[PDB]
Design a protein around this ligand. Structure first.
Ligand SMILES: *[C@@H]1O[C@H](CO[C@@H]2O[C@@H](C)[C@@H](O)[C@@H](O)[C@@H]2O)[C@@H](O[C@@H]2O[C@H](CO)[C@@H](O)[C@H](O)[C@H]2NC(C)=O)[C@H](O[C@H]2O[C@@H](C)[C@@H](O)[C@@H](O)[C@@H]2O)[C@H]1NC(C)=O
Ligand SMILES: CC(=O)N[C@@H]1[C@@H](O[C@@H]2O[C@H](CO)[C@H](O)[C@H](O[C@]3(C(=O)O)C[C@H](O)[C@@H](NC(C)=O)[C@H]([C@H](O)[C@H](O)CO)O3)[C@H]2O)[C@H](O)[C@@H](CO)O[C@H]1O
Ligand SMILES: *[C@@H]1O[C@H](CO)[C@@H](O[C@@H]2O[C@H](CO)[C@@H](O)[C@H](O)[C@H]2NC(C)=O)[C@H](O[C@H]2O[C@@H](C)[C@@H](O)[C@@H](O)[C@@H]2O)[C@H]1NC(C)=O
Ligand SMILES: *[C@@H]1O[C@H](CO)[C@@H](O[C@@H]2O[C@H](CO)[C@@H](O)[C@H](O)[C@H]2NC(C)=O)[C@H](O[C@H]2O[C@@H](C)[C@@H](O)[C@@H](O)[C@@H]2O)[C@H]1NC(C)=O
Ligand SMILES: *[C@@H]1O[C@H](CO)[C@@H](O)[C@H](O)[C@H]1NC(C)=O
Ligand SMILES: *[C@@H]1O[C@H](CO)[C@@H](O)[C@H](O)[C@H]1NC(C)=O
Ligand SMILES: *[C@@H]1O[C@H](CO)[C@@H](O)[C@H](O)[C@H]1NC(C)=O
Lengths: 323, 175, 175, 175, 323, 323
């Protein structure tokens, strides 16, 4: 007859979760663990406590030079990272180019804090006209110019040779900016600066530069055939910079003290501030997760999961489940 | 599969056993019932959790891409930069996917190894005092209260102490 | 292998069996013959075909070199470009060679596990109605026609239907 | 283990066993003793030795870093050079750690499989001429000199030639 | 006697295929699958339907500038890829250099078809001699020059200032080429161009260029020590290019319209056309295969297997084969 | 009675070595094999038979131009590799810059031996003064100058035009160096070179160069405001170089024949020679090991193990050891 019995067996449940293996796809299991974060909040946030520098329709060039349409950023506080649009609208308002722009941008992504100072006051130009202005650079319906540099022109009918120097008596390093104007023809040249053959010299402990205008006829850009070409240098503490020019000189007014360096980046994004806080930021949204992986975007900053191009990553933790 | 136990000589699991991964269903005079073998379940819950932490910690140092910008006459190095960053993202994506596939394959066969070893654990204990039905069940040759079943689950079952009543019974079948 | 069946307690394969990978040789009054277990060979072909496709689909996104030229004063980055591309070609060559070695070894142990699981499939049905010779063979304690053999190959073999005829036979031997 | 032999149904190893990796503790009329199974150990030293050779030469083609210098307005390509070289070093450091982590675990299970196959090697040969005590030991139903013991270790043990004495002895116990 | 039996076993055959494992090499198996393509046809073929542009002994510069010895290529049809020899014979016939050449070559790998047009007629130079010629650039037994640019010199005894403009009224973008001549001494400078001190200005919406000749003493190359330096730009649709010069100006005659962009490459090969067809081409031969890997060459174009540096790749499908 | 027995078992020992796996850590095992080298000897050695070039407080620039404080390296024997400090003290003694320096250092890592030769004897300048000297370049307590180039100045009150030439009739290639001086003001330019408007022309079969001084105001570096800028080229066997100048010219005196080519590198380190020998060298110490891996430093030269960042790497060879 049937006596007493005993049997060995395993757990089953009502799970419907699936994992993959190399010999077999979509295997149903009793217990599984997803290890891939696939959601973000779609916003730009503070990183730890610290707010990002969100430019709007302004480019890096627009901000530092002081495009008149960018007055929001005339004095910014310490930031955690920087956000810039793909094709900012407020860039170089007067047409031209920015020498070594991509190297300045890389430097900027190693910096967390500037403190702007005035190095040569606008009321120190006593033999030249320091009120140059252009319709390609409007402010409130009227013609203006970059706020951190000055367009000097002839006064009376003369442009005496300029010799000016500045000594960095600050403890931190200085970012200094300047430019040169390339006119359209010989006639325009004499009306602005009087002398027909001009130059700009700039010297430092390491910089030894000489610029000469290119006078010629070119296509119209925003109604102008003239060009402006800009330059930058880092002036170390206790060094001096020397300017000499007899025309076409776009001179310094303000410069930046490098107060703090650290990890930062320049993000390309169309978003705006989201009044939130996070420890992981991507160009399309922030992440609050404990997963070891994520698949939202490869360009991130902060304390983040690792990026992979997978659509699914789920780990079997339990055993195979009976149908 | 690699094992013969799960979906093997034992087909299907017990929805009614909800205390562990592995255990026992006994059916004697004192009704029926379930019991989870904690020790084999404990080595299994600890074993798998060691696995998931090791894989996470092996991946904390992994390539991170940063944006760099180039002008219009830097097309060649721009193309260098793009191909190098894409290259590493493909390498590490392959490394993670293939690793999850490989360790999924071992995890399922691991539970299975533990089922067969537990079955073989008691089959080695009872010996000729029971019959192997061949589907995970053992019908033994004597009577067991609610302290005998306990002696096999804690691995103390003294074989000769029940050999006699059993010896009688298998001769009765041999009649 | 890791299982002991192929090139183990079962020695050598059968050239005369040409309908599958694993199977049965029966020896009764209606002569001899070979017969393949269709069910286990098909699930075995499905496993391997999945594997080989998985290995191909895991390599579809892989680094591709493109030619770039540099002038006589771009030597540092010419060297950078060359090493980066050579670097990816060494990584993906390692990934493909090593994956093949690993999955070769497991494919061979997959067949080994499959031969033994088929053997225990039969050992569990007959039990004391047959004897383990120790070479993959079962010698019955009763008679098996060409429809008894069939009941074992599809796992329908009725045990108590032969329990009596068999029990008597081993007593003639054990007396 | 994944097989149940090491730290399983056979507990602990033998400090007195110092001639091979796997073997026997024999106890007959001619005293006690230890003995190594030579044949299976050679396939075992050959197996691990091939593994380590395969593991080393698969890594002989691997990224080598070169020093390159850049001036103060080459920060972008200086940074590219650094990420690429750091990138390949993390990849090959990962590759080396994970491969050792993986093949350690398989090396331990290779030994466990080799013991169980050895145990089954004598158990399939003896059958009812001995009893499984449940700890890896076999107690004969007859007496075995130091020339019977050898026939099992070279796998020649003639079963029917000793079946009767065992059968008689076992009925004496079954009375 | 022996009674009835039933036995379990596995497949065997007379196969000789071998597979490798991490623990064991050369394992003979019943079935294996090769996954590495190791063969090519040794010819240069069409890619799908499209014939390649096979320059012969001409280089890309020779073709684009119009070396008189490359007249085969004055007007080529749409191509699938470009074949150039390692050390082409017909290059810059007049000694000198080609500015940003490798960036231009990179640009060309995104182009499948050019359409040549004439932008300045040879009979438009009415105050200069537009028939400059050299023995280093022979045609049909006589001295010649590049066909797509024109060598202007003084007429009677004068060289007036040139002010010329061109507006790209085409729908497509234009590849425009031009040059400057560096003489050997002040005397040669006067017999050809009369004025001792010359310049060339070129302007665009994005370009602001100024060239000045370098008169000096150099080694002889092909019997000449004079030099020619060439430049290029891409003129956007509806933009204009402006030239101003008082000497040493090698002016544009023909320019190239970018008609079709797509996938292309420049292959280095010594081989010649083979009147065949393929979907996968390498510099040393084409591939017709179904293998997922190959080892012929790393530089391919088309629908190709994945490249590896392995000699063998075989996958175990069956089981170990009994002798 | 108990009959006969036979038992199954495995090897055990008194070992304590531990290996790791993915499911369990610190598993003590009977047999293991270490494969990671973790020790170095902490010194700089010969590579095979060949001693490295150890500049001390000299840079490559200081060495090759002949900084007066580097006379130790005026004629160096064949080297195996080069060792340099992070911030050497003897660099460019006269303040200024060295053009394409990093490309030249790269060229240097395929070179094992220079053989110095003279191009222009110091007493061959019969119409110029060839003895320029500066306090920024001291020798034994007095003012000196670079030894491999010469500072030419006006003699009497003239600086006649210089036309100098050299044909490389050697089988090997030549490394040639020269420079230009940038004064601080017009008075100094006249004091040194007489002519106010000056130039340097350099021509080769492939080089066509023209330099003009940049005269301007700069910070004082080591008490000086003048600058020197240096240049280089490789002159092919059987080619010729041509120089022409009417002022500011720092002429070649010595040049270098590249006599032995091979594998080398430039190591950054603070150590000094160690009278030892090795076949694998790193910046912080040498390696004598047979392990397939090491973890000392990523930059090695010679026949070395492969570098990894692991603290420990041990392989399980035996089996699990009983507690
Ligand atoms: C650099 O010098 C070489 C060889 O020495 C010269 O050869 C004598 C004829 C005479 O000129 C000596 O005063 C020189 O030191 C010279 O190569 C020789 O040139 C001559 C003239 O054509 C020929 O003898 C022959 O061409 C060649 N001789 C040998 C034995 O190689 C170089 O000038 C010329 O080099 C050859 C390779 C040609 O390319 C030729 O056009 C070129 O002018 C001279 N280097 C330069 C740049 O002149
Ligand atoms: C700019 C100024 O006013 N400097 C004053 C000092 O004059 C200069 O000071 C330095 C440092 O003390 C040197 O002596 C300069 O003299 C040399 C030099 O380099 O040592 C003398 C060399 O003989 C001369 N070489 C040649 C070939 O002419 C060299 C060069 O002329 C210049 O370097 C070219 O750029 O200059 C000296 O000119 C002054 O000595 C000091 C104290 O009174 O005060 C400084 O303000
Ligand atoms: C920038 O101005 C500062 C402030 O005066 C100068 O540093 C001081 O200069 C005085 C005047 O000789 C002298 O005591 C020290 O050199 C220094 N004093 C202190 C307390 O800092 C600096 O001039 C000088 O700086 C030194 C380091 C060196 O460059 C010297 O040659 C130079 O004249 C000014 N910097 C420059 C580049 O002019
Ligand atoms: C190249 O020629 C075309 C053809 O005329 C110019 O486009 C036209 O210019 C006129 C002149 O003001 C004006 O009707 C339009 O601007 C335009 N019309 C048509 C039907 O195309 C072009 O010049 C103009 O191009 C536009 C885009 C704008 O930038 C305007 O400021 C400019 O004058 C000529 N290109 C250049 C660079 O001048
Ligand atoms: C696996 O399951 C998902 C769940 O929807 C399904 O979309 C997919 O097609 C399945 N894959 C296969 C190979 O059946
Ligand atoms: C494996 O077999 C092939 C077939 O001849 C042979 O060429 C090769 O040398 C063998 N392997 C080794 C390690 O020699
Ligand atoms: C493993 O052993 C080492 C050495 O004895 C010890 O330092 C380490 O802490 C152990 N592991 C853990 C997780 O503690």
């Amino acid at each position: 007859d049937p006596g007493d019995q005993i049997c060995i067996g395993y757990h089953a449940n009502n799970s419907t979760e699936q994992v993959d293996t190399i010999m077999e796809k979509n295997v149903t299991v009793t217990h599984a663990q997803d290890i891939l974060e696939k959601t973000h909040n779609g916003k730009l946030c503070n990183l730890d406590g610290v707010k990002p520098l969100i430019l709007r329709d302004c480019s890096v060039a627009g901000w530092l030079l002081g495009n008149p349409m960018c007055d929001e950023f005339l004095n910014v506080p310490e930031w955690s990272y920087i956000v810039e649009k793909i094709n900012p609208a407020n860039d170089l308002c007067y047409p031209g180019n920015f020498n070594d722009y991509e190297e300045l941008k890389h430097l900027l992504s190693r910096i967390n804090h500037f403190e702007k100072i005035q190095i040569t006051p606008k009321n120190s130009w006593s033999d030249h006209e320091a009120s140059g202005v252009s319709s390609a650079c409007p402010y409130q319906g009227r013609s203006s110019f970059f706020r951190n540099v000055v367009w000097l022109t002839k006064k009376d009918n003369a442009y005496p040779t300029i010799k000016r120097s500045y000594n960095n008596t600050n403890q931190e390093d200085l970012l200094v900016l300047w430019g040169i104007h390339h006119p359209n023809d010989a006639t325009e040249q004499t009306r602005l600066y009087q002398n027909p053959t001009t130059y700009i010299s700039v010297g430092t402990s390491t910089l030894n530069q000489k610029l000469v205008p290119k006078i010629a006829t070119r296509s119209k850009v925003k109604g102008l055939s003239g060009r402006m070409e800009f330059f930058w240098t880092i002036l170390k503490s206790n060094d001096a910079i020397n300017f000499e020019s007899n025309g076409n000189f776009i001179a310094p007014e303000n410069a930046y003290k490098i107060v703090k360096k650290g990890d930062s980046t320049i993000m390309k994004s169309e978003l705006e501030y989201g009044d939130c806080n996070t420890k992981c930021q991507t160009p399309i949204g922030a992440i609050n997760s404990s997963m070891p992986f994520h698949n939202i975007h490869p360009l991130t900053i902060g304390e983040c999961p690792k990026y992979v191009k997978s659509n699914r990553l789920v780990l079997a933790t339990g055993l195979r489940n009976s149908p | 599969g690699l094992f013969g136990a799960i979906a093997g000589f034992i087909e299907g699991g017990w929805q009614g056993m909800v205390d562990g991964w592995y255990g026992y269903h006994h059916s004697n005079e004192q009704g029926s019932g379930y019991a989870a073998d904690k020790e084999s379940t404990q080595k299994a819950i600890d074993g798998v959790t060691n696995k998931v932490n090791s894989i996470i910690d092996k991946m904390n140092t992994q390539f991170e891409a940063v944006g760099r910008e180039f002008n219009n006459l830097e097309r060649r190095i721009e193309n260098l930069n793009k191909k190098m960053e894409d290259g590493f993202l493909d390498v590490w994506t392959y490394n993670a996917e293939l690793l999850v596939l490989m360790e999924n394959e071992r995890t399922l066969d691991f539970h299975d190894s533990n089922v067969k070893n537990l079955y073989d654990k008691v089959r080695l204990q009872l010996r000729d005092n029971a019959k192997e039905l061949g589907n995970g069940c053992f019908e033994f040759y004597h009577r067991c209260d609610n302290e005998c079943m306990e002696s096999v689950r804690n691995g103390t079952y003294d074989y000769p102490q029940y050999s006699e009543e059993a010896r009688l019974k298998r001769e009765e079948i041999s009649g």
